């Protein structure tokens, strides 16, 4: 069998979540896609899902991926952004889900885009364990004293209500899917500007995995037969 790493998410469980009272059993949008995908394969792929994470906070998805390279996982399935530093060390499938960083702020703030957020001094929220933190420090070079980790959508909504003047944030930077779910229950906020990364979600496998390529093709069949939008509709103003 394959030891497949699965992120142990504490928020936005609609994507990936451990079943309560199990350790190797998972449900969510990402699992269902992955299952469907393996079924279209011409051969059998036995998997054992292994949780990655302490169950208190969302794990570092980059460290989770690294476990493939240390030979601890034969692969990783979850809501994993295909980003450049990760692609350097493993082989992702093609994106089964489109994603990309956006700015979420209250309707009618002075913050209109990523650009206007950078030039200010005000604090920014990011999701705990997201590559977002790395991007904000290295590519956009925003000071670490401005970045505020946030574990849950409740945490999101609080830091936005509180605002900068009450140890909250002026805005949150996060991948659209999480943002879209958050806004379902919090219509008071909006995505200012456009998407400013095109990093999609994929399944991670060791460099030179025939699995990675064969599933990339599988994902396409699911998209053409409308099963991707079907599974989306089933899990996800």
Residues of this chain that interact with ligand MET (CB under 6 A) are 58, 61, 79-81, 127-131, 175
Minimum gap (Å) between residue 42 Cβ and ligand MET: 30
Ligand-binding annotation for 182, yes or no, is no
Q: How far apart are CA 131 and CA 33, in angstroms?
A: 22
- Pick the closer one to ligand MET by CB: 40 or 66: 66
- Pick the closer one to ligand MET by CB: 61 or 182: 61
Residue for token pair 């206007």: 116
Ligand-binding annotation for 79, yes or no, is yes
Minimum gap (Å) between residue 87 Cβ and ligand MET: 12
CA distances from 99 to 150, 177, 180 (A): 19, 6, 11
Residue 117, helix vs strand vs coil: helix
Ligand-binding annotation for 86, yes or no, is yes
Ligand-binding annotation for 146, yes or no, is no
Minimum gap (Å) between residue 165 Cβ and ligand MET: 27
Minimum gap (Å) between residue 199 Cβ and ligand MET: 8
Inter-axis angle of helices 227-235 and 210-224, nearest 10 = 80
At a CB cut-off of 8 Å and minimum separation 6, what does 84 contact?
none
């Amino acid at each position: 069998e394959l030891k497949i790493g699965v992120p142990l998410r504490v928020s936005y469980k609609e994507f990936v979540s451990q079943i309560r009272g199990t350790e190797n059993m998972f449900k969510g949008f990402c699992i269902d896609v992955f299952t469907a995908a393996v079924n279209l394969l011409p051969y059998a792929v036995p998997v054992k899902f292994i949780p990655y994470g302490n169950g208190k906070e969302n794990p570092s998805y980059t460290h989770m991926v690294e476990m493939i390279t240390t030979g601890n996982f034969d692969g990783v399935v979850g809501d994993v952004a295909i980003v450049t530093n990760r692609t350097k060390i493993v082989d992702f499938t093609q994106p089964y889900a489109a994603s990309g960083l956006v700015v979420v702020a209250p309707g009618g703030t002075p913050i209109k885009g990523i650009e206007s957020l950078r030039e200010r001094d005000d604090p920014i929220g990011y999701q705990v364990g997201s590559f977002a933190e790395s991007y904000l420090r290295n590519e956009l070079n925003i000071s670490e004293s401005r970045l505020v980790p946030l574990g849950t959508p409740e945490a999101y909504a609080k830091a936005l209500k509180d605002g900068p003047s009450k140890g909250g944030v002026a805005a949150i930077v996060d991948e659209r899917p999480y943002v879209e779910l958050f806004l379902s229950s919090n219509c008071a906020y909006r995505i200012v500007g456009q998407e400013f990364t095109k990093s999609g979600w994929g399944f991670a496998f060791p460099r030179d995995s025939p699995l990675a390529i064969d599933l990339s093709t599988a994902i396409l069949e699911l998209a053409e037969n409308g099963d991707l939008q079907r599974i989306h509709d089933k899990w996800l103003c």
